[PDB]
Amino acid sequence: RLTERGRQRRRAMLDAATQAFLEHGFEGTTLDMVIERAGGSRGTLYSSFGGKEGLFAAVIAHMIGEIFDPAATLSATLEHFGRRFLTSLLDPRCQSLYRLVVAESPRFPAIGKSFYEQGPQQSYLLLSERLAAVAPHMDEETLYAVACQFLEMLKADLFLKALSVADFQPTMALLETRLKLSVDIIACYLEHLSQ
């Protein structure tokens, strides 16, 4: 229902709403705050997004693209993917995206389901495909299971700690310590798996 000028106003409102939700969470973010940051009118927002839920759904989907959407050896494949995964995950905006979805998934189940499929699940599937290239004779179901365990292992004593402990900031030294161990563990397993 929007012209080119309408598409500009919509993208502007989406950017302001994104910033607002990150700072204040869903409950503390009002449509008035979005109008004050992005200009325009409260009514034009209802037409573009449908209301607070529709706006919040668009904000989550927009952030998913922002944060989410070949090496010679297995160790380098794990290391390169693991590093990019940790840098994306530990970004404070990504932490907020996770906090928002976990807080509001019961109230908005469609948003939580969309987040998982297009975020974490896509990360698992992408690694599984890269792993198949360097381990071409391995069961695809096993590679997917291993891919999930590797990516989750990178979060250990880091992601939930950052989400729960306000002063705690993961150092780059911490990331590299966890990355090296996780790669060593998973590579060891795969290098002994095929007998």
Next chain:
Amino acid sequence: PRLTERGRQRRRAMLDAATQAFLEHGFEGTTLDMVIERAGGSRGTLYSSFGGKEGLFAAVIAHMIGEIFDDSAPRPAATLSATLEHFGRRFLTSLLDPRCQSLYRLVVAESPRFPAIGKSFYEQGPQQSYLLLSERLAAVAPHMDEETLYAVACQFLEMLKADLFLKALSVADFQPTMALLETRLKLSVDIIACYLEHLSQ
């Protein structure tokens, strides 16, 4: 803050009602009036016992930590695989309990507003689980570096969550089957045991 027995009963009763209320409605959707309706008493006694909504919520979180983790409530197993499997199974059964999922949702949602609550949760919950396993691991791997054992303990417990815990937190229809739990547990045990059995050469 109450020296009487009847005050201690009313306080524990209000704590139980508030716990159920916060679990169902979250922090923002839980009012002190809802707690009074479930636990009886008066709004004023709630303010005296807990200090207000923040103090009540802090007590609720701390209470839930004891309920779900409950100190050291197993026996040392003979093998490394059994040690990982037994601890991993108890960890997953505790973690995937719908009340535990709610405790995690509450803490992550409210940690920025109440940093003291989030920090207390981590130290007394997940961090204690990591430390307990690392101690059990030292018994069956007595010549291993304790810093490495703690690092391995953390990785094992977190990998048990893979494609499971966050999925349950985010996907409303998704319910982890016990078949799924056992599938993840067997793989994680196999991975970590393989690593440790080659670490000391």
